[PDB]
């Protein structure tokens, strides 16, 4: 009978109370949807246990790239049938530009974005006063000032990777970016040891070498890095949109900072190309078609409350007073969308083994292993490179 809908933890405890109320608001084709949350840690497993049991979900949300895996598997709903429906109800033509392409393949469209969900840096502006530094620019100026934060006994570039936290995951590979490099070449094969990768690697062992990262932040959960920034702990860091509202402090003093150069010149951001995909396990795929129309059309909500800790994919929203009237929201949209890269990088094609990537061991191990500096940079990186030709299919 019901369509059972799962959803992530994807910013306050108060972002799934309203979007639990959205889809058991859900009475269309003469059915109901059932809201379940999934949480992070070890979600990969928990998803692939699941379909391969037979006892997942209708519809979800999840990893960035999770739909490709289970399209691979046979176990995804295509969504042409949800896109033809946007197009007659009039959605469709609100789309930003490119959001929903990447997710059109030979076969029909594994999913449907819902939010891109980019990384911006942060400061805390009292915090930068009392250390007497400036905001970064790029790596040197981000260790110099980091220094001198850590002399005032503040956390310079605040980061975790305990258990549910995936932040440290993405500050690997933002870094990576950051330098031009990448998990793979533009043709999409694995490329991890290139020298750009291994001097960005080594500049995170020197931030944890001279105490910029905390020494524990290899143990910090989200709820662990949340309080640093709340407590003004953190001075500077790699986090999410909408970190005030996030962590519950808005006094104004936590400000979006600019992009920071690489030591070659290079720019990049790090973004998510999330997506609610449909699955093949459901009582009825109409009605899972009808969920996914009716739960993209309340998203506005979600900002309107500004719920949300990343960006929307519709052009009504990205235009919403709630929305740019937050100066912090207008400079990631500015300084950050334009040099934004993903997982791919440096290819741009979207694939499984984006999932495998993603929500693997081997990521997590190669950070949890930098963030500790366990070893030398060439070590790790291949160290890395092995667990992922492990996994992903070459
Ligand atoms: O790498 C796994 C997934 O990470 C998602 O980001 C999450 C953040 O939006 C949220 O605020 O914090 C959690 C816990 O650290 C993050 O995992 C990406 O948006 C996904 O695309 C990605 O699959």
């Known amino acids: 009978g019901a369509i059972k809908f799962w959803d992530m933890p994807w ?67 295509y969504a042409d049938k949800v896109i033809e429906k946007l197009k007659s109800n009039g959605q469709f033509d609100d789309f930003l530009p490119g959001v929903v392409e990447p997710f059109k393949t ?29 905001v970064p620019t790029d790596w040197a100026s981000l260790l110099e000032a980091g220094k001198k934060l850590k002399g005032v006994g503040a956390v310079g570039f605040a980061t975790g990777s305990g258990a549910g936290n995936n ?13 031009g490099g990448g998990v793979f070449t533009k043709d999409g094969e694995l490329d991890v040891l290139n020298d750009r990768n291994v001097e960005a690697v080594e500049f995170l062992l020197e931030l944890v070498s001279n105490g910029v990262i905390d020494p524990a932040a290899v143990s910090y959960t989200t709820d662990n890095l949340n309080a640093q920034w709340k407590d003004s702990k953190a001075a500077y860091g790699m986090l999410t949109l909408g970190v005030p509202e996030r962590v519950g ?47 993209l059309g309340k998203l506005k ?22 929305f740019t009237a937050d100066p912090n929201n207008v400079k990631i949209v500015n300084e950050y969308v334009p040099i934004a890269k993903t997982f791919a990088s440096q290819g741009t094609a979207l694939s499984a083994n984006l999932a495998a990537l993603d929500g693997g061991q081997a990521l997590n191990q190669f950070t949890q ?15 890395f490179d092995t667990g992922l030709k492990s996994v992903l299919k070459k």
């Open 11 to 77: 910013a306050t405890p108060a972002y799934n109370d309203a979007a639990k109320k959205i889809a058991e608001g859900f009475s269309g084709a003469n059915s109901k949807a059932t809201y379940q949350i999934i949480q992070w840690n070890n979600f990969y497993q928990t998803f692939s246990s699941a379909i391969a049991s037979k006892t997942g979900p209708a519809v979800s949300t999840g990893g960035g790239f999770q739909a490709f895996q289970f399209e691979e598997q046979g176990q995804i709903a």
């Open 106 to 134: 030979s076969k029909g469209y594994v999913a449907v974005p819902w939010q891109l969900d980019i990384r911006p840096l942060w400061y805390r502006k009292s915090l930068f006063e009392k250390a007497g530094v400036g």
């Open 167 to 179: 932040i440290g995951n993405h500050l690997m590979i933002m870094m990576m970016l950051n330098n």
């Open 249 to 295: 402090d808005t006094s104004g003093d936590i400000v979006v900072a600019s992009p920071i150069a690489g030591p070659h010149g290079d720019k990049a951001a790090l973004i998510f190309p999330n997506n609610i995909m449909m699955y093949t396990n459901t009582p009825s795929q109409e009605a899972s078609e009808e969920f996914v129309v009716y739960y």
């Open 301 to 322: 909500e979600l900002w309107q409350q500004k719920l949300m800790n990343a960006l929307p994919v519709f052009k009504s929203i990205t235009e919403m007073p709630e």
């Open 369 to 383: 292993t930098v963030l500790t500096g366990k070893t030398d940079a060439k070590s790790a990186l291949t160290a």
